Structures are given as C-alpha cells and as structure tokens.
Symmetry: C2
Subunit: 137 residues, 2 copies
Amino acid sequence: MFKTILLAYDGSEHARRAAEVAKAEAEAHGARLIVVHAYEPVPDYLGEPFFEEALRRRLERAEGVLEEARALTGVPKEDALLLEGVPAEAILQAARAEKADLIVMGTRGLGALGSLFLGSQSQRVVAEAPCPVLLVR
Amino acid sequence: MFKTILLAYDGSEHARRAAEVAKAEAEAHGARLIVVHAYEPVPDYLGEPFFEEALRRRLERAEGVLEEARALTGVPKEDALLLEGVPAEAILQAARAEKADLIVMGTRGLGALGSLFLGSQSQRVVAEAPCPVLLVR
C-alpha cells in the first residue's frame, strides 16, 4: 500500500516552506508526493480581446508557479497537478481522489480572502479534509 | 541534531488518533516523541474539604490520561509530561522549550470551549505555534 502526501502550492513564501516540509515527509514515510496548484479561471465578463489575452497569461503564470513547486520538490511531471477552480475545493477533490494521507499547506495564501489567523482557503481545507492537515507558516 | 515531535493528548478520540499519527511521524523521521497532557488546576474558591478531595482526583485522572498516551505511543516516562495550566499555553511553552519541529494535536478537545471547526485550545496553538502543526480529526 502506499501513503500519499498532497502539497498545496501557490508560490507564496508559506507554500515554499510547506514544500520543504512535504518533501521531507514524503522521503521519511517513503510516500508518493503529489503537488497541486489551483487557479481560478479568468472572469467571463471580460470582452474580446482582453479575455483571451488574460486567459493566456493566467495559464502561463499558473504553469510557472507549478513548475517552481516541481523544481523544489523533485516530483515527476505527472505528479504535479494544475487544477482550475475554487482552490480549497480543488485541493479537497484531489485529496479525496488521490486517497491522501496528509495534506501539507501554508497557513495563508491560495486565494484572495483571509485573516492573520488563516487564509480562507486553508480554513476550508482544515474544516473539510478527508485526512490530517499539516499547516506551515 | 534531532527532530522533536510534540503530541498534545487529552484522552479524546481525536487525541488517540493524533497519538497514532505522532508515533508514525516520530518513527519515520527518527525523531524524539514528547507527549504532553495539560490540566487546569482545581479552582481555589472551593472550601475544605472539597478543594483537597478535588485536587487529589484531578491529579490522579490527569496522570491516568497521560499514562494512557504513554502506553499508546511507547515513549519513556521522562518524555511524557504533565503540565498544569491553560492547555494551549502549556503546549506552546513546551513546544518552545523542547524546540519542537512539529506539534501533532486533535482538532478538538483540550479544553472547555470550542466549535465544530476547532477547539479553542487547538485554534490558539495554530495561531501561535513556533513550528508546523499537524491537525488530526
């Protein structure tokens, strides 16, 4: 059987630190490490040609952030997932689908709303995760 | 150098599950596991002989809960600590003093006030911990 560590990464300093923690946990447990970056879609009230230009830049940056996480953790490309949607929901859906044993994530980052206690996306994952959550500042 | 995993234990089902997680983390990392149980003191407005009888029962139960955690994790007696005071503050003071690398704790338990999102003591530890926190339901 194998254990799976899921890292939520958004390019924030919190997430870089979470990446170092998740790499060490996967190595210590002999577990598979899956890295996920989730991005919200460009809003569709933008008109031509702005929508299309924003769609291209948004995806290119999202892929640049996920490539960074793959470079910091060393996981194969198939294990670095790019999900479009509400971040916490993407993370929780990946954790369920991958039968994750632990989700490692920064205390803050991942979305636009949060407090100095937790970002709104980390708080939703802590409330609904199907496995233990390792929070990293 | 050595890594230290600190387990907060209160005898709740959350804490029993956290104990299984903390035992596996210490084994996987080759880390020292310190188990802490914190209890609040008997209130001193109780009169004689009630105060003294409550003092004796409270300490005996606190030691029974900590012995349970030592039996579930296998740590030596010197590594199972019994602290009297506000739970989260005892936990955070132990984590600082023991240079903890991770605190593993249930999402709920440890005190008298909490919500269905987190107990008030887990929330304070998440807000102030000197290291990453691994929350376990």
